[PDB]
Symmetry: D2
Subunit: 506 residues, 4 copies
C-alpha cells in the first residue's frame, strides 16, 4: 500500500520546508524504499516559466526550485507532474467542464477541484512507482490560496486507510532575547488553524533562532495534541548534515512507525562521508560573472565538484572597465552563467580569461559570450554579437531558431576536452534557451581555432552544443544547463573538470 507523508508550513514561510521534505525523503531512501516528492505551489501561475531560479526537469517543465532540491536529495529525475499549482488545477478542471466532461453537473471547488488535486498526486506517484510519496504544500496554513490543497490532502486519510498517511507541520518558535524565552503560542495557533480545516498534525518540526529545548518541545506537545516524541527541533546548522541530525533526533524512526513500517536501520554512509569531505583537503576560489536562489543549482554544482576534488570552493561574485586584473587576482577560474540586460562586461571577462589562460566555463549565455568574444578578437568579425543584444549586428554569430527545454541529446566529439570530462560519446543535458550559435558562422570560427566539441542530432536540430580551445589549460562552454543534472552522488563533469583545472591553476 502506498504511503503518503504530507508536509505543511505554519506561522511564516522560508523556514526550510524544501530541505525538510528533501531530507525526509532521503532518510526514507536510505531505508530501501522507492520514494518521490511533490511540491504544491498554491500560486495561480500555471508553472514557473513566467517568473529565484526556475528549475528545469528532463521533460522540459519549468518549475519551482524545490524540485531541484528533491532531485539532488533523491538522486531522481522528476517531471512536471511533481510540481502542482492552483493554475494547473483550475485550468484543467475548467477546460474539462467546457468540454462537457462533467455531464451537465455544477462544478465546485469541493469535490471537483479537490478530486483533480488528489488525482494528480496519485497519477505522478503511480508513474514513478513510489512506495512512499512526500508531498510538500507551499504557502502558509491559513491563507486562502492553500485551502483547496489542504482539503485535498485531508481527504487522503479516509481514502488511503489507517497507517498509510502522516501529516507533518513545520512552524516557527520565536526567541525573544530580552526575556530570553521561547514562544510556542504561534505554533499553538497555527496547529489550531490546521485543525480548523480538519487536519491534526501527527508530527511537529520546530524552527527557531536557537535550538529548541526539550522543555519547550514538551510544552508544544502538551498544547497541540501531539505526542512529545513526535515534536522535533529544526536548528540552523552544511545542508548535507540536515538529514543526518534529523535521523539522530528520531524523525526517521518516528515517520517509520507511524506509517506502520517495521524499523530498518538507515544506511547514511553517503551523507556522512559527504559531510566528512565538507574540512576539505584544499581550497580554490573561482569567480562567477554576475550580480542567491537565482543560482541555486549552479552553486550546488560547484559544491558537488569541490567534493569530487576533495576541495572547498570559495565564490567571488564578479560583476562585469579594464580594471579586471584586480577583480581576477587570487582567483583560479572564471564562470559565466546563463542569463540578460548587458553583456559587454562579460565579453570582457571571457576575453581576459582567454588571454591569461584562466580556467573558463560558460553556461548557456556563457557559451554564447565566449563565441561572440572569439568571433571578434580572433575571427576578426568586428561588432559580432547575438541578435538578442544587438538585432542589427553585421555578424549575428548567435541568433534565433526558453525554446529548447529539458533533456536534449549531445554528441561529444572524440578526444576533446569535453570528451575527457564526460568519458562518453553521448549524453543528455537540460535546456532552456531560444538563442543558438548561428550555423553560417561555424565554419569560419573553427578555421580560427574555435573547437565545436558537441552538437545535437536534433529532436529538430544539428546545432552547436559545446565549444572549447585546444589552447588554454581549460576553456569550455555548453548551451545547456549542466548544473540541473548535477547531484552530490554524481557531480556534473563540466563543473568537476572546471574545478580540477582551477586546482591545477592553483
Amino acid at each position: 500500500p502506498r504511503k503518503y507523508v504530507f508536509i505543511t508550513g505554519g506561522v511564516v514561510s522560508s523556514l526550510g520546508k524544501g530541505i525538510l521534505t528533501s531530507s525526509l525523503g532521503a532518510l526514507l531512501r536510505a531505508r530501501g524504499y522507492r520514494v518521490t516528492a511533490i511540491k504544491i505551489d498554491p500560486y495561480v501561475n500555471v508553472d514557473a516559466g513566467t517568473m529565484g531560479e526556475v528549475f528545469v526537469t528532463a521533460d522540459g517543465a519549468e518549475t519551482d526550485l524545490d524540485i531541484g532540491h528533491y532531485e539532488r536529495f533523491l538522486d531522481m529525475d522528476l517531471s512536471r507532474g511533481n510540481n502542482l499549482t492552483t493554475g494547473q488545477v483550475y485550468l484543467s478542471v475548467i477546460q474539462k467542464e467546457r468540454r462537457g466532461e462533467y455531464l451537465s453537473q455544477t462544478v465546485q471547488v469541493i469535490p471537483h477541484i479537490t478530486d483533480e488535486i488528489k488525482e494528480r498526486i496519485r497519477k505522478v506517484a503511480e508513474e514513478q512507482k513510489a512506495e512512499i510519496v512526500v508531498v510538500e504544500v507551499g504557502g502558509t496554513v491559513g491563507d486562502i490560496e492553500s485551502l483547496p490543497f489542504l482539503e485535498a490532502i485531508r481527504q487522503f486519510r479516509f481514502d488511503e486507510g489507517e497507517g498509510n498517511t502522516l501529516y507533518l507541520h513545520l512552524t516557527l518558535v520565536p526567541y525573544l532575547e530580552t526575556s530570553e524565552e521561547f514562544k510556542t503560542k504561534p505554533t499553538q495557533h497555527s496547529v489550531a488553524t490546521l485543525r480548523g480545516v480538519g487536519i491534526q498534525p501527527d508530527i511537529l518540526v520546530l524552527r527557531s533562532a536557537r535550538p529548541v529545548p526539550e522543555e519547550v518541545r514538551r510544552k508544544v506537545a502538551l498544547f497541540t495534541n501531539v505526542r512529545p516524541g513526535h515534536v522535533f527541533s529544526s536548528p540552523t546548522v552544511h545542508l548535507y548534515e540536515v538529514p543526518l541530525l534529523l535521523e539522530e533526533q528520531g524523525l526517521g524512526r518516528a515517520v517509520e512507525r507511524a506509517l506502520g513500517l517495521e524499523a530498518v536501520i538507515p544506511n547514511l554512509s553517503f551523507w556522512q562521508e559527504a559531510v566528512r569531505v565538507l574540512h576539505p583537503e584544499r581550497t580554490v576560489k573561482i569567480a562567477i560573472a554576475g550580480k542567491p536562489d537565482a543560482y541555486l543549482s549552479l552553486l550546488e554544482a560547484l559544491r558537488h565538484a569541490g567534493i569530487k576534488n576533495r576541495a572547498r570552493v570559495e565564490v567571488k561574485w564578479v560583476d562585469a572597465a579594464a580594471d579586471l586584473d584586480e577583480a581576477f587576482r587570487d582567483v583560479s577560474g572564471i564562470l559565466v552563467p546563463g542569463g540578460v540586460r548587458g553583456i559587454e562586461g562579460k565579453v570582457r571577462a571571457a576575453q581576459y580569461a582567454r588571454e591569461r589562460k584562466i580556467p573558463y566555463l560558460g553556461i548557456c549565455l556563457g557559451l554564447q559570450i565566449a563565441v561572440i568574444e572569439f568571433a571578434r578578437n580572433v575571427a576578426g568579425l568586428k561588432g559580432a554579437n547575438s541578435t538578442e543584444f544587438d538585432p542589427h549586428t553585421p555578424h549575428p554569430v548567435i541568433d534565433l531558431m526558453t525554446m529548447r527545454l529539458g533533456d536534449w541529446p549531445m554528441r561529444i566529439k572524440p578526444g576533446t576536452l569535453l570528451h575527457r570530462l564526460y568519458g562518453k560519446e553521448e549524453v543528455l543535458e537540460r535546456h532552456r534557451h531560444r538563442y543558438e550559435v548561428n550555423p553560417l558562422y561555424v565554419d569560419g570560427l573553427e578555421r580560427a581555432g574555435l573547437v565545436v566539441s558537441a552538437t545535437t542530432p536534433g529532436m529538430g536540430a544539428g546545432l552547436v552544443e559545446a565549444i572549447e580551445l585546444k589552447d588554454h589549460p581549460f576553456f569550455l562552454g555548453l548551451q545547456s544547463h549542466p548544473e540541473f543534472k548535477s547531484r552530490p552522488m554524481r557531480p556534473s563533469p563540466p563543473f568537476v573538470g572546471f574545478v580540477e583545472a582551477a586546482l591545477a591553476y592553483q
Copy 2:
C-alpha cells in the same frame, strides 16, 4: 459617486435572495435611480451553458436564471457581464499570466483574483451607467468557493469611501413548533462567520416559516451589532407584492439613508396596480406539453399575459396514446415549450390542437414539432422529422445549420396573425438552438397551407422564424424564446395573443 449594495446569504441557500435583489433594485428604480444588478455564481463553470432554466441575455450569454429576475424587475437588458463565476475569473487571470501580462509577478488569489473580480463589477456598472449597483453573491457565507468574492466585495468599502457601500445579509430563522419558538442562533453564527472574513453586515433580512416578530428581530439586532431598524422580516407571501411589503417595512428608506441619499418617496404605482390585477376578471386554463425553475421565464410570460388580459391563468401540465380528449378537456389552449428525449407525444398534441381548433403556441422545439406535424399529416411527407430525433428520416424538414444565441432580428410578414400581435414589421427575439426549418421543404409546406409569417435577414441567416395557419383561431410557433424578453411592464405578444385566444376559446 456610484453606490454599491452587496447582498449575501447565510445558514442555507434558496431563501429567495434573487427576488430580494430584484425587489431592492426595483425599489431603487421607483426612486428615479439608474440601477443594475449583478449575480455572482461561485461555481467553477465558466457560464451556465453546460448545465433550472438557463436564461439568455440579448448578447447571447447563457446565465443563471436570476438574471431573468433582474431583467423583469428592472425592465432592463443585462449582459454576460452581469453574471460572474469562479471559472470566468480564474480563467481570465490565468490566461493573462500566461501572456506574461503580470510582468513576471507571482499571481495569487489576493490581490490578482480579487482585483479581477472588482474590475468586472465596475466594468459592467460603467457600461450600464449605473448609479446604484446591486451585487448578489451566490452560495452560502462560509463555503470556501465564495471566499475570493467575499474578500473582493469587502475591499469596496475602502475603495469607494464612506457612504457608498452597504452590505445586506439574508439568513434563516428556524421555527420549532414543539417549543413554538424562533431560533436566532444560526443568524448569530452566520454573521460571526461574515465578520471572520472581515465583513460586518449593515442590514439583516430574516426568513422563517412564519413572519419574524419584532421581539425576535430586536434580539437578532442585539447579538449581531446591527441596528434594530436595520433588521427586517422576509415572510412567505404573489412575488409582485414582495417589493411592496419590503418598502412598507422600511427597507427602502433604510438603504436610502445608509447610502447617504436624501429620501425620495418611491412611486410604486405599477407594482400596486399589478398585484391589484393579480383577484382577476376571468380565469382560463392552458396546457403546457411537458413534465419548475426549468420553465421560470415561460411561466412568468403566461403571468404577464394573464395580466394584460385582466385574467388569471391556470396551468395544467400535460405529459405526452390517443387518450388526449381527456388530457385536453377543460383547457382552452396548448403550449409546446422549447426542449429533448422523445417527441412523438408532442407531435400528437400539435395534431390534436390543430384539428380541434385549440389555441396553440410552440416555442423553439414547439415550432419544429408543429412543422413536423404539418409536413406529415397535411403535406403528406410520411416519417417527416428533425434530424435531431431521427437522423435517417427521409424528410428532414428540421435540420442543422444552442448555436444561434441572443437577440436576432425577425421580419414579420405584413397582415399575418404574427403581425397582429407585434403590430410592427421588425423586432428582436432571443435565441438558443441549433436546429432550424429546412430551407428545401419550405416551398412545399406553404403550398399545403403552412404560413411563414417571419424570417431573418441573418447576422448569417434567412431562416424561418415563425409559422402559423390562416385557418384555426390561433396557431403560432416561433424559433426564438420570446418569454426571455417578456416583462410585467411589457408582456410578450405571442403570449398575450395566445392568452387572448384562450379567452375567446373560453
Copy 3:
C-alpha cells in the same frame, strides 16, 4: 475500562438532546451495563435554585430538568454531581487558588478550569460505579460559554485511550417546503466549528421537520467525515418509543462497536410493553389547578400512573368565581400542584373537590391549600391562611420553620388511605419547601376530622407530611414532591392511587 460517550448539540438548541441522552443511556442499560448520565449546563448559575421545572435529587440538589429525564430513563438516583455548571467550576477553582492550593501558580482556563471539569466528571462516575457514562453538553457548539467544556471533553480522548470515548453531535436539518428540499449546510458548518475546537464527531443525529432520507443522510456523511452508518435521523414521534426507534436504526449497535464492546442483543421488553399500553383500556380526564416544562415531572407522574392503571389520562388545565361546576364537569379528579402569586382560587377548588367527593391530590402547596381550606370551612377558623400569602392571618395554620431539600423520611400511619397506596410503614420522598403545617393547630384540625397520615422523625423535624379524610372517596395531600421519584418502571403511589379513584369516580 470506563467508557465515555459525549453528546453535543449544534445549529440550534431544543432538539431533544435530553431525551437523546436518556434514550442512549437506556439502550446501554438494556445491554446490562452500569450507566450514568451527566448534564453540563454552561450558564454561570451555580445551580438551578435561583431560577421550566427545577428538579430535585435525593441529596437535595436543585438541578436542570434533564436530570429528571435521566433518572426516569435510567431508573437511577442521581446527585448534584450529575449537573455541572460554569459557576460551580469557576467558583470551585477560584476558591482553591484563594487558599493558595495552586502553590503560587498562575491559574488559567486551560488547564486549571478544564482539569476541574474532567475531575468532576470522573468523580461522579466513580461514586456511581459507572461502566459507561453519557455526558450531555448543554448549549450550542460555537457559543463561548461552552468552550471550556468542549476542551475538557476533547482531552478525554487522549486521557482514556483508544476505544474508550465516543462523540455524538445532534444538529438540525432545516426543511424548506417551497423547494421541498432538506438543507445539510448548517450541519456541515456546525461540524466544522466542532473540528475548530479540536473535535471530530463520530456519530451524527439529524433532527428535521420531516424524517431525514438516507440520501440526505448519506450526503451529510460525505461532507462531515462521518461514516454513513454513523448518521441517524431523529424524527418527531410517545417519548417512550424514542429509544425503540433509535435501536431499530442501529444507534445502539453503532455506539457499542465504536466503544469496542462485543455486541449484546438489548432487552427492550419494558419499553415495548410500555408503549404497548400507551392504545389504552380506558380514559379519564383529571384537572390540574394552574396556568409546560414547569410541570414535567408532575405530568410524567400522571403518565406512569395511567400506565399502571392501563388507562390514558387527559389533562384539563383549570386556572383558579363560583363558576366551577363547569370548569369541573367531565372531570374525575382535581390536582393542586406545588407552587405562588394568589391562592384563594385554589382554596376554592379544594373546597369544591371536598364537598362534591371528587378525587383530590395536593402536592406541596396543594396540601397546605387543603389544610387552609379545612381549617376555615370545617374547623371554623375564619381567615385561616399560610403566613406566605397573609403574614397577618389570625390563624397561621401554615407557617415557617426551598428549605427542606431532597429525600426526607416519612412515617405512614397504619391502615390509612396513605398506607394503602404505599403498602409500607416508611418511605423517603423529596422536598423543596419552606412552609409547613403549624404544629399548634394540628390538634384542633384532627378533632374536626382532618387525618394526619404521615409525619417525619426529622433529619430535624416532627412535621406533618400528609393529610387525608376518612370521608371522601379519595382526598390526599403530601408536603413533598412525590412526582420527583416517579419512574415509568415504578409509578409514584399517590399518583397511582389518585388515578385509580379517578377511574372509580368514572
Copy 4:
C-alpha cells in the same frame, strides 16, 4: 465625552505592551488630559497576592507589575480597580446571582460577565475623573481566556458612540536573517483573529528584532485594512525614550485625531530632560543582596535616585562565608531588599556594611535583618532572630502582629537621618508584610545605640517604621516598600539619600 483607547496584543506576549500603554498615556498627559490606565489580566486568580514583582497600590491591592509602570508614567495613584482579572469578574457575578440579584434570570457570559467587565472599567474611570482611559488587555488575542474581555471592549464602540473609542494592536514581525526578510504573515493572521471576535484594529504597532521598514509597514497596512499612517514600529532602544520616539513617529498625533481631538503640541520637556541625564555626570556601583522583574520597582527607584543625583548607578548582585571584602570591593553601598528562604548571609552583609561604614538601606526584610544584626552583635542578644526564620529563638526581636497593606502613615522623628531625607514630619508609604519589630525589645535596642526614626499612629499600630544609626555615614531601614511610590518625577527619598551617600562614599 470620555475616550477609550484599548490596547491588545497578538502573535506572542512580552513585547512591551505595558510600556506601550504607559508611554501612550504619558503622551496624552503631555497634552493636558486627565488620563488613567487599566490592566486586564485574564488569569483566573482574583488578584496577584497568591503569586515577577507584585506591585502594591495605596489602597492595599496586590497587583500585576504593569500597575507600577502606569503609576510611574502617569505620576498617578491607581487602585485595585485598575487591575481586572477573570476571577474577580466571575466571582463577582457569581455571588450576585447567588443573592438572587439577577432576578431568576439565567446568567450567561454574554451579557452578564461582559456587562460586569464594562461596568468595572467605567466605574474606575469615573472615580478617577478620567477624560481618556487607556485599557490594556493582557494575554494574546486568540486564547480563550481573553474572549469575554475582547467582547466587552468591542461593545464599547457602540456604547460610547463615534469618535470615542480606538483600538490598538501590538504584534510581532519576525525577522529571518538567512533570508534577511521581515515576516508580516503572523500580524495578518492575528488581525484576522481579532476581526473574528468582531474587532478591527485602528492602529498597529510592530515589534521586531530590527526596526520595521516603511516598506514592511506599508505592506502590513495593505493586508490588515489599517491606514498606512496608523502603522508604527516599536523598536528596541532607555525606556524613557520610548514615549519620545513614539511621539516622533506620529503615534501621538494619530491617536489624537482618531479620537476627534483638536491637535495639541505635547510638552515632553520632562522626558527629554530625563533621557538627557540618562550620559550622566558620575557613576557609583551599589550592591543588592539577592539572587529581574522581581525587583522592577526597586531598580526603578535606584534609577530615579541616580537621576536626582545626576549620576548613573551600576548594580552588582551579591548573593549572600566571610569572603565579603571581595564581594564588596569597588562598591559604595549595600541594599538588602524585601523578601524568604535563608537570612544569615544577609545578616552577615548588614554586619559588614555596619562595621566598614558602607552606606546601607534595608527594605522590609532588609530592616528586620539590620535589627537582628544589631541585637546580636551590639545589643548582645545571642541567637536573636525573627520568628519567621526561627520560631524558637530566645530573642524574637522581629515577630508577628502581607498583613499590613498599602499606604500607612509614618511619623518621622525630628532631626534624624530619616528626617533629613524626607524633610517632613509625616508621610505615607506602602506596606506588604506580616512581621514587625517586637515592641518588647525596642527599649534595649535604643539603649545600645539603635535609633527608631519612625513609627506609626496605627490605622491599628504604634510599630517601628524606620531605624538608623547616628554613627555610620548612612545606615537606614524602613518596614514599608518606599520603592512603590518612587516616580521619575519624584524619586523616593530613602533611595535618593542612599545614592547620595554612595556618591560621598565614592
